[PDB]
Write a protein that binds this ligand. Structure first.
Ligand SMILES: O=C(NCc1c(F)cc(F)cc1F)c1cn2c(c(O)c1=O)C(=O)N1[C@H]3CC[C@H](C3)O[C@@H]1C2
Ligand SMILES: O=C(NCc1c(F)cc(F)cc1F)c1cn2c(c(O)c1=O)C(=O)N1[C@H]3CC[C@H](C3)O[C@@H]1C2
Ligand SMILES: [Mg+2]
Ligand SMILES: [Mg+2]
Ligand SMILES: [Mg+2]
Ligand SMILES: [Mg+2]
Ligand SMILES: [Zn+2]
Ligand SMILES: [Zn+2]
Ligand SMILES: [Zn+2]
Ligand SMILES: [Zn+2]
Lengths: 65, 47, 249, 224, 249, 65, 224, 47
DNA sequence: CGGGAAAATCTCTAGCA
DNA sequence: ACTGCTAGAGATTTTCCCG
DNA sequence: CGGGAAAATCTCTAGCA
DNA sequence: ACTGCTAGAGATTTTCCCG
């Protein structure tokens, strides 16, 4: 159904950045992907990162676990 | 109302004051002497 | 101490002393001295000590012409992955940049190109190529190369790799293509331990897959949480259309 | 964990590939790969095809990704070995090229192309290219009017073929198809790396070492 | 996996891939791949990501010639305080630098001058002036201006202040002296909230006072703490001749 | 006697730096001043800083306390 | 604290300056300054002297710090007002010059020197300079042989006078004397700043606010 | 024994290897092809 | 002790050419 | 064997001042 | 749990010209 | 209304592996 698809879209990792921190934050869990914003979960914190500030990848090092 | 003192293009001198039309993160859009310019926030000071 | 304010005004008109000197010499609170300095136009000579952040969407590229051995190398980078495409062009004309850019847009899904204000990129020829291929043209602040900090950086790396393979090739174009190969497929490290090619493939495949997944998700979920839209329902939070707020329907 | 023997039974009756048994049962890909590799019933992405087409008196190198149809064309000034080697080096730097199929032309068997393939690590081996030369020529004839030179018309045709012509099974374009194929290829290579990394270890073949529970293959029976 | 080591060697001879690419592609431990990279001469192209620290003794000065409006300004800075002395010189000859430096050494207690490898400072004329006044000549690494990072920085500031007072003076030398005045006495802030003049006075007076105080202290204290010398006896530590160690005599 | 002189030499402040930290540490208390080294007390830590790494001042803002 | 009334008694009998009562009794300088300022019995560093000397047909501007003897000389090409103003601006930028004493020469009363003094904030007011011109001329005559031009000989004489000739009370040089005098001047200015900063406060004149114990002057009796 | 790869004077190319004669904080003294050079540690890599 | 405000410290950048 | 720094603009942590 | 070793993260710099 | 970054060299904190 749709729960499998929600788990699938949560299987993706997001490397984001804040407005004034120049270093790339860790691989947050992608909860929702919009046209201009991206909802992530990083360290049990739900953030809304602009689309221009996020690199969303499915790290193919997922072939280990 | 704000004053902006900026550095324009390969010119070491600073100009201003200029009216702040828009402030984004990273750059600003200002209006100096009926000319609209876009200056990075590293090359602009806002009062 | 407001007479000290007048004395400090009249002495800053001469020496342009900073706020600390005027606060020490005339017994002024830091606010008053800072305002005396901030009202002098001649003392505004330093900008904000920060840096912006370039756009790193999965569809934006950054292009720049570099020079090596008296030849022009037009380079493009995928800002989200570091995947580079470089070509030794016979001239820095816009008619060659339009060809390079149309070729690139045919190879990869280019949605936006961010360039400096070089005549090559500012021309009507590159403007027509972008309109045909459906690309959006973004130009940095004039004489602010930090706006293109990605591609400029890649320039360095590209040249670096060329210096390591310049003697394996007889011509400069062959060495440039060797450097592109080495950067895209023989140098790993980054946000996934990937190479630039693996990273661009991951970025684009992920964009497509997540777009289709979300298009299928929103088509099923119909829940209003004012009457906003449910974006994601969690165990301790509820996202609406975007804040992280409930009366879910 | 609790889905290992279950997936063994499904593969006993349905014989699903490891990619299905992995994501459907939360199994690490190594475990599902050993499940599919322990059966008797169950026991490309880098192949390109090059050719030279002649149009308007110009020579066009056309390279097709046989697995996805993703085309890549270039109007070259001469049908010589140097420009063929340049095209091949460009392509190999742009995409993960592992094997090239050519029609035994004078410009494909030259020493320069051989050196380029040796450097880029390409295997040179001497039906799809014909059909896609026909399709590319049709698209060029369609969009020839919008170009002043033939090279830009060829690039426009390549753009239209790779990103505007959708078809096939699910209605995807050639670009989406090639990026998906290369993504699955990357997954396959990473899984092969993970499998080779833990074949040296003896525990009873090791398959996965999680939090504190190792996955073992003992007497060809997977035992967590 | 030592055959993987041979394959990685033979492939690094071609692509000069970094250690992570060779560790991923050939199943090599990070140590082996890093050693394969570290054995290639062509891959050593980056230096240590650090910075030195200039000598800031109370007797060392840093000198540099800058240029403004087509004229040469010889500037000196007290590295420990930021006290500057600048002069518009008619030429960049060493015969003028020797005069400036002898004058400075007559004004202040100059023990060491640190300069770049400009011909002005490298000459026999400045070498004789330093030998007479008893100054020690130190030269930075050739073409490494960071070794003079203090004075170069001051150059900037000096020019900056000149731009604020250029219209108060009719000549450039008057504006340079105005800038020296403003820097040394009209700009506060630093390690004491001082100006450069107050700071140099504090530095030098403190040097003299502490030297005499310690000369009087060691003349009285005679305690051996091997048989070292007691430098300072504390409640939880004892300093000897220098470690922070007892059998004090 | 000499205890007054030791207190006097301890009344001086030292701004020092470590070998690889580019920022100037706070005003440690000067315990001993040699020709090549300087013994300081910073945050109850007795350090031996090279002479080239220390700016020793008697902050004349001592006219407050 | 416990030494306030004690220092009051010492100043009643010995009348030590505030610098002594401060460091000898651990008193804040404001408290000892109010102690010395509350007595009936008890109720320069920026003065320079300029002149022009003529030697070997050259003109030499000589500026003496009257408080310490620290000399500063410069061979100028002409005895005009412009070069005098330049010398004065140089000096004022180098040292804290507050007052200059001149011999009413044609080059000291010119408008340019007046403008330079007005800009640098120097007060121009129209015995030591004569003796130290004599001493500087003697040193120049001593070291004239070691120089090819007179300007370098003058600078050598200035060096020798400021850092090689030691004398006076404690055997210090002119440079040590001027740096000590300017240091005590800085201490005086900082103490005056501290005194002006807390004369606005009324508690009973405030003198010092330590950890939680304020120092007060009530009925002209200091009361912590 | 150490190898040093350095950058000499306004020359973007890197040279080496060179014997490390002295390592201080900030700079090193090396010997390359019978010529002794002093290079900052920012422009030198030691193996 | 609870904040608000203010001073002190931290962070980061350009020019030195 | 010698060596980046300095001052200013914001941001953030610390301290002080009244209840 | 106690370290040792190794991998992962943090810090900082040059060149892009 | 737009925007520094990237990869490498050490240093330091985290994790894993055996007892
Ligand atoms: O300074 C440059 N690089 C070095 C550098 C950097 F990369 C990044 C930084 F943060 C700082 C840097 F110092 C640089 C300068 N220009 C151009 C470049 O591409 C370029 O890289 C360019 O093309 N134009 C055209 C557009 C108008 C005309 C022609 O003047 C500009 C000048
Ligand atoms: O690059 C310079 N400044 C800018 C800068 C800086 F200040 C500090 C940095 F960390 C970085 C910088 F980019 C600079 C270059 N040179 C000289 C300077 O004084 C000077 O400041 C100089 O005098 N010489 C002579 C000695 C041999 C000849 C003549 O070449 C050098 C070249
Ligand atoms: Mg450019
Ligand atoms: Mg560029
Ligand atoms: Mg110089
Ligand atoms: Mg310089
Ligand atoms: Zn001002
Ligand atoms: Zn099977
Ligand atoms: Zn190599
Ligand atoms: Zn009295």
């Amino acid at each position: 159904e749709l729960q499998k698809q929600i788990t699938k879209i949560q299987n993706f990792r997001v490397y984001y950045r804040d407005s004034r921190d120049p270093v790339w934050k860790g691989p947050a869990k992608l909860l929702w992907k919009g046209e201009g914003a991206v909802v992530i979960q990083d360290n049990s914190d739900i953030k809304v990162v602009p689309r221009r500030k996020a690199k969303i990848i499915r790290d193919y090092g997922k072939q280990m676990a | 109302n704000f004053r902006v003192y900026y550095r324009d293009s390969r010119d070491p001198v600073w100009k201003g004051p200029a009216k702040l039309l828009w402030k984004g993160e990273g750059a600003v859009v200002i209006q100096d002497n009926s000319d609209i310019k876009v200056v990075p926030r590293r090359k602009a000071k806002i009062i | 101490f407001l007479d000290g304010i007048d004395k400090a005004q009249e002495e800053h008109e001469k020496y342009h002393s900073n706020w600390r000197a005027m606060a020490s010499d005339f017994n002024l609170p830091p606010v008053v001295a800072k305002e005396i300095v901030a009202s002098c136009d001649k003392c505004q000579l330093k900008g904000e000590a920060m840096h912006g952040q370039v756009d790193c969407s999965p569809g934006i590229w950054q292009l720049d012409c570099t020079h090596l051995e008296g030849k022009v190398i037009l380079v493009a980078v995928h800002v989200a992955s570091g995947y580079i495409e470089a070509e030794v062009i016979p001239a820095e004309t816009g008619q060659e940049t339009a060809y390079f850019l149309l070729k690139l847009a045919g190879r990869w899904p280019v949605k936006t190109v961010h360039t400096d204000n070089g005549s090559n990129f500012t021309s009507t020829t590159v403007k027509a190529a972008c309109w045909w291929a459906g690309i959006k043209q973004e130009f940095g602040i004039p004489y602010n190369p930090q706006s293109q900090g990605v591609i400029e950086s890649m320039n360095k790396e590209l040249k670096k790799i060329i210096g390591q393979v310049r003697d394996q090739a007889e011509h400069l174009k062959t060495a440039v293509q060797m450097a592109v190969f080495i950067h895209n497929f023989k140098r790993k490290g980054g946000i996934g331990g990937y190479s630039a090619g693996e990273r661009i493939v991951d970025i684009i495949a992920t964009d497509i897959q997540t777009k289709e997944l979300q298009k299928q998700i929103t088509k099923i979920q119909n829940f209003r949480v004012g009457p906003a839209k449910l974006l994601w329902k969690g165990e301790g939070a509820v996202v609406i259309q975007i804040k992280v707020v409930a009366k879910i329907i």
